[PDB]
Design a protein around this ligand. Structure first.
Ligand SMILES: Nc1ncnc2c1ncn2[C@@H]1O[C@H](CSCC[C@H](N)C(=O)O)[C@@H](O)[C@H]1O
Ligand code: SF4
Ligand code: SF4
Lengths: 11, 316
């Protein structure tokens, strides 16, 4: 998702 | 928007990708002071509402001792951590073993690895494979592979050369945001265009996510496009997270953007014949591309002020 583009995110 | 927070640790990177939204390189000097970052991390760890702290850059593993020290400040408070990296450190399997052991003992719930044709001149394919393969031993860490692509560089061979190391890994190929090095080093004809000024009913921001950026400012999201805008949530050097959240929730521009979408701002520019004057692009790779072009100067933001004031008096 765009709002968390430059970040690691859980599935 | 107070359950997650991100810190951009530094603009310094071992790579110098031609698309980089921050133009990161080994000689990049933009960063917040280390002691200031220790204080932000301590505050976020002590905060009762924050559940997830994310680190980004730049390359966060470049100064690993400082990253591990920040992860250790958070440890007694049991907050979840996410990391994103170019995986340069994957060159050594022993180094990979050490870092996965640390991430697992420091509540790192997600690791995103970026690899594509733009990252390839700086990191070997084998380094990425080492990280992807060892991650199988840590099923509680959600692993992702992010690939930034253009029409001339679609990363079709990168994926084949990664072999079976990508099995079970979530892969997302995404287009470029025309910011930073992508503005001058990539031909605009090579950036995919999925949206136009006419399909405005699809231009809605996916949601806010607070980022304390390496330029010392605070942004309402982590999209590459936001960092070129003048939308900041910082009003002073020592600002609490409660104040940051209060400002995000009382920002009239961001409230109007969330409730009405980009078409509210685009229709004002069309009505007043300011599309050419503001250099609004006709086509774009994503919804964030409109965002950047509407608000990437103080003149542009201020321009909307009387219309936002009228909206506030009419509604509320
Ligand atoms: N102009 C741009 N458009 C789209 N994605 C971009 C971009 N500039 C950088 N990115 C992506 O933003 C993500 C975080 S960049 C910082 C983290 C790290 N150096 C890394 O490379 O992962 C990376 O996946 C990168 O490819
Ligand atoms: S995209 Fe990531 S690895 Fe490439 S220059 Fe930017 S910060 Fe460094
Ligand atoms: S750049 Fe704009 S549209 Fe994209 S995530 Fe950030 S606030 Fe939302």
């Amino acid at each position: 998702k765009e709002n968390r583009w430059i970040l690691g995110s859980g599935h | 928007y107070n359950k997650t927070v991100s810190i951009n640790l530094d603009s310094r990177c071992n790579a110098s990708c031609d698309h980089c939204c921050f133009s990161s390189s080994p000689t990049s000097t933009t960063r917040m002071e280390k002691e200031y970052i220790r204080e932000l991390v301590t505050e976020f760890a002590k905060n009762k509402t924050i559940q997830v702290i994310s680190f980004t850059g730049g390359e966060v593993f470049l100064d690993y001792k400082f990253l591990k020290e920040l992860m250790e400040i958070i440890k007694p408070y049991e907050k979840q951590i996410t990391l994103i990296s170019n995986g340069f450190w994957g060159l050594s399997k022993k180094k990979v073993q050490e870092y996965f052991h640390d991430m697992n003992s420091l509540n790192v719930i997600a690791l995103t690895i970026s690899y594509d044709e733009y990252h390839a001149p700086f990191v070997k394919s084998s380094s990425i494979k080492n990280i992807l393969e060892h991650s199988r031993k840590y099923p509680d860490i959600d692993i992702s592979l992010n690939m930034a692509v253009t029409k001339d560089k679609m990363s079709n061979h990168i994926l084949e050369e990664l072999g079976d190391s990508i099995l079970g890994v979530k892969i997302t190929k995404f287009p470029m945001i025309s910011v930073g090095a992508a503005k001058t080093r990539i031909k605009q004809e090579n950036i995919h265009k999925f949206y136009s000024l006419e399909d405005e009913d699809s231009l809605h921001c996916p949601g806010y996510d607070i980022v304390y950026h390496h330029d010392g400012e605070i942004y309402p999201c982590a999209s590459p496009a936001i960092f070129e805008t003048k939308i900041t949530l910082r009003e002073e050097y020592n600002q609490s997270f409660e104040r940051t959240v209060e400002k995000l929730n009382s920002n009239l521009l961001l409230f109007i953007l969330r409730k009405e979408g980009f078409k509210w701002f685009l229709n004002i520019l069309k009505e007043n014949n300011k599309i050419e004057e503001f250099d609004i692009p006709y086509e774009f790779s994503s919804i964030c591309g409109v965002c950047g072009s509407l608000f990437n100067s103080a003149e542009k933001i201020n321009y909307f002020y009387p219309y936002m004031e009228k909206y506030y008096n009419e509604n509320f």
